Amino acid sequence: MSTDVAAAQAQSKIDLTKKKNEEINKKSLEEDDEFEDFPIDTWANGETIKSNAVTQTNIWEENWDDVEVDDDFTNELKAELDRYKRENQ
Amino acid sequence: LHHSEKKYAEEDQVQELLKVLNEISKTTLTLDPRYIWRSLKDLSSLRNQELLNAETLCFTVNVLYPDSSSFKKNLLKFITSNHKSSVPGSAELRNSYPASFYSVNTEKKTIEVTAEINCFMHLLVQLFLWDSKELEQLVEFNRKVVIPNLLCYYNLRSLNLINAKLWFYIYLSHETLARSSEEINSDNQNIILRSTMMKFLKIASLKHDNETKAMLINLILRDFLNNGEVDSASDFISKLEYPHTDVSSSLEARYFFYLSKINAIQLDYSTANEYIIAAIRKAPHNSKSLGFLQQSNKLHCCIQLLMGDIPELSFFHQSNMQKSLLPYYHLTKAVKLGDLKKFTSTITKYKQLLLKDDTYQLCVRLRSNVIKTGIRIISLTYKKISLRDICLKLNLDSEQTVEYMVSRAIRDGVIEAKINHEDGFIETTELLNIYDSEDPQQVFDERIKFANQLHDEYLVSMRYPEDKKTQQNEK
Amino acid sequence: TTAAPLLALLRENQDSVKTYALESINNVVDQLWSEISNELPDIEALYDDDTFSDREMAALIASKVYYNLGEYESAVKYALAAKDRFDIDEKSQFVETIVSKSIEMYVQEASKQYTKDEQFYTKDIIDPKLTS
Amino acid sequence: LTKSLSIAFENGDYAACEKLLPPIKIELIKNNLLIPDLSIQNDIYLNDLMITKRILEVGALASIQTFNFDSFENYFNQLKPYYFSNNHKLSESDKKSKLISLYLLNLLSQNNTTKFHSELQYLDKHIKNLEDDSLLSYPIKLDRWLMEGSYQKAWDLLQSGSQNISEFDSFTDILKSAIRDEIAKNTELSYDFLPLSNIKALLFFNNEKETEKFALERNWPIVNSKVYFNNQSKEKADYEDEMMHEEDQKTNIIEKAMDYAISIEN
């Protein structure tokens, strides 16, 4: 669990005995770890992270899709319906 | 056996205290004491938790105490009393010291230097209460006891730096009790909590302690935000003094994150964006810092939709923070597409969660940005476009209404078009080729100065730790 | 907290609540310092008006506000203008801060005027409160 | 004095309330000292607390209606400590919901949206789902419609509040004056020509004479019944060039290199 590019802050900072208390204090100030509160709070577990292939687990790269609706069914309807107009022209 | 275990924990603590005591006898300093003090606090936080509830008590009894040892013990009575290891041989000592708080000397009262010792016993009682994860009356008793002790005399520079870290815990435990079960006296005591924090900042100004000043500023910003007293915090942030000289990088992370909150409320989305990226890059990647990052990322997505900038889809996918950030991911897709219908679903589906973080207020301002982002997409896509076509796409009213949206929207410059009301279209003004204008001149200048500023910071910092080592004997 | 009830008292048109306002602002001047600094010119208008006997009190507020802002130079001027009500905070365990800056400022002035002639103890460049 | 203000409010006289209030201000000092000022709250300091809220509550609603917005903001500021704390024990009432609704319009009719949104947090903590929005929805809806930019939805919401001649309407007319000014800020970029019948339409006038009258005051040159925004734009640009900002506002070709030069030698 890492914010932006995972490796970019994993190399940027690492643990020290000196820092360890202050870090724990930061997460307590907001009041929780805020990733284990959320399943109880909603009273469900993920199904809406299953929206797209890339959303569930990042084991691909980004497409820049966000609904992932096949565009073959609409392009097929345009193709045939246009021909007929020209046939009846 | 049982005496050995409490004695071992005590001996760890003694070496850390003795180290600082020696350092402040030569000449009081700020930073060299702190690095040791931070290492001790970690060990105490881990030993209080893991090893019984009476390992603090042994120490407290062992040293001379104004009345603290009895106030410590009270807390332990409630959760099943302790009485063990307070007989001589835990109270017939004051624990190896050369002569400055040694057993023989202190009891004899040839010296008494309870000065440093009292501040550290405070540090234990705060740690021990957050370890227990308990609140009630014990909080009140912690508030009452330590504050006037520290206010009935001025502190030395070293002692002021211990007492800055106690103020955070007092504040945090009061605020959690309200969130477990709200009460009616928690509200009236909050005025009391409020009074001490600002009065503290004045006290630290005279001692000229850089690290003490910074940590109190972080507290005042947080305290205003949960009370929602933003008005008073808006006066504060234009009249600060923060140093970045000796502060830890956790303090700096927090400071920038607070600004981003207040700024976003004042409808500054451009300054808020700069500072929230600052806060994240200081913070670690760790699960230690996890909860700090979630609240930060919640705000970071929100600022971008307020601008019209629209976060990355990658950003949720590269982190494993997906489920926390699930409501902002549904807003991201909604504003981009222009679909109000998608947007209205998101804010009803997840209302409860948003309202918990008190970021719901910020989220309703986004019903506007769908409409304004929708007109910018339509002006990109068609250079000239009828009024009616907009009304179909974004599910709006008359064309007269749509005219008004654009007239207002180009006062900020969101659409960057202009309306012809006798020609009946909307004509955008972009047709790039600004490299034939004088614009890049202005830009390159700024990047050059940005580089100059990083050079300067490099100069002062590079030699200051170098200087400490070369002076210091190690030959 | 908020300083907003306190501003309203100055603005309220009766004599009586204007006298009480200076007392109320001054109690918690270390809590609400950043708030009341914006509207410190309101308090300067009450110093002008001669319908107050808390003129001295109004001036005293200004000192504590300017120290927390960062300018120590301005605070000592207006501490000297207040006249008395500044001899009670020389031994507190909380605020001696405004006082100590006076000891510094006399040393700066003292060097400058000694060189002209040894006497400078009858110059009006040195305030009589400052010497005390 | 003290109970006399209450019944003067009730009758419908508000010139009566303000006349009589400077006497009661002295006794408001007496009341304030009876409570510790909310350090602890008994049922005895509850009795005292009602006295303190009462003088100020009725003073502040009355201020609006004599068109002393300045005085309104003074009384309202005084209520705030009681409003803050001790909730669910004589701190929250029907009058409170009415009084805060009116204040949010005050900040908005002054045209400070900096303040309005920062004041809204403070209220988040208090009632907005503990006494739900039924009168506080009004100022929040309005602020939103001008942020998307729809002046249609905004004028309508004001016009149906004009049906309700109470004291909410005293801030509605200010807010209809404000919609005109905003549009008059926009129209400079938006067009260059509008016929006079068209200017009337955007500025929400029903009278063509009324349009011409606003133009004098708002400094629009309508010549032969057509406006010239390009002239107005010039004047305002000219003013902005005049003021001292000006070397590094433009940023001179020479000035850039001079900066670079001394940095490498320093």
Curated annotation (Swiss-Prot), chain A:
Modified residues (Phosphoserine): 12
Residue ranges of the TM segments: none
In-chain residues carrying the UniProt-annotated modification N-acetylserine: 2
Taxonomic superkingdom: Eukaryota
Keywords for the protein's UniProt record, in alphabetical order: Acetylation, Phosphoprotein, Proteasome, Transcription
Any single Gene Ontology cellular-component annotation: proteasome complex
Keyword Endoplasmic reticulum: no
GO BP annotations listed: double-strand break repair via homologous recombination; filamentous growth; maintenance of DNA trinucleotide repeats; mRNA export from nucleus; positive regulation of transcription by RNA polymerase II; proteasome assembly; proteasome-mediated ubiquitin-dependent protein catabolic process; regulation of cell cycle
Subunit structure and binding partners: Part of the 26S proteasome. Associates with the nuclear pore complex (NPC)-associated TREX-2 complex and the COP9 signalosome. Interacts with CSN12 and THP3.
Protein name: 26S proteasome complex subunit SEM1
Organism from which the protein derives: Saccharomyces cerevisiae (strain ATCC 204508 / S288c) (Baker's yeast)
Underlying gene: SEM1
Curated annotation (Swiss-Prot), chain B:
UniProt-listed PROSITE patterns: PCI (PS50250)
Modified residues (Phosphoserine): 437
Residues in PCI domain copies: 253-433
MF GO annotations: enzyme regulator activity
Ranges annotated as spanning the membrane: none
Biological processes, Gene Ontology terms: proteasome-mediated ubiquitin-dependent protein catabolic process; regulation of protein catabolic process; ubiquitin-dependent protein catabolic process
UniProt KW keywords: Acetylation, Phosphoprotein, Proteasome
Bias (Basic and acidic residues): 463-475
Family the UniProt entry places it in: Belongs to the proteasome subunit S3 family.
UniProt function note: Acts as a regulatory subunit of the 26S proteasome which is involved in the ATP-dependent degradation of ubiquitinated proteins.
Name of the protein: 26S proteasome regulatory subunit RPN3
Organism: Saccharomyces cerevisiae (strain ATCC 204508 / S288c) (Baker's yeast)
Gene name of the record: RPN3
From Swiss-Prot, chain C:
PTM section of the record: N-acetylated by NAT1.
Coiled coil: none
Superkingdom field: Eukaryota
Miscellaneous comment as given in the Swiss-Prot or TrEMBL entry: Present with 4750 molecules/cell in log phase SD medium.
Family: Belongs to the proteasome subunit S1 family.
Record text on subunit structure and interactions: Interacts with UBR1.
Stated role: Acts as a regulatory subunit of the 26S proteasome which is involved in the ATP-dependent degradation of ubiquitinated proteins.
Protein name: 26S proteasome regulatory subunit RPN2
The species this protein was found in: Saccharomyces cerevisiae (strain ATCC 204508 / S288c) (Baker's yeast)
Gene: RPN2
Positions spanned in the full protein: 4 to 135 of 945
UniProtKB/Swiss-Prot annotation, chain D:
Protein keywords: Proteasome
InterPro entries according to UniProt: 26S_Psome_Rpn12, CSN8_PSD8_EIF3K, PCI_dom
Domain PCI: 70-245
One cellular component (GO) term of this entry: proteasome regulatory particle, lid subcomplex
Listed Gene3D superfamilies: 1.25.40.990
Any GO BP: proteasome-mediated ubiquitin-dependent protein catabolic process
Nuclease is among the record's keywords: no
Function: Acts as a regulatory subunit of the 26S proteasome which is involved in the ATP-dependent degradation of ubiquitinated proteins. Necessary for activation of the CDC28 kinase.
Similarity annotation: Belongs to the proteasome subunit S14 family.
Other remarks on this protein: Present with 9890 molecules/cell in log phase SD medium.
Name listed for the protein in its UniProt record: 26S proteasome regulatory subunit RPN12
Organism per entry: Saccharomyces cerevisiae (strain ATCC 204508 / S288c)
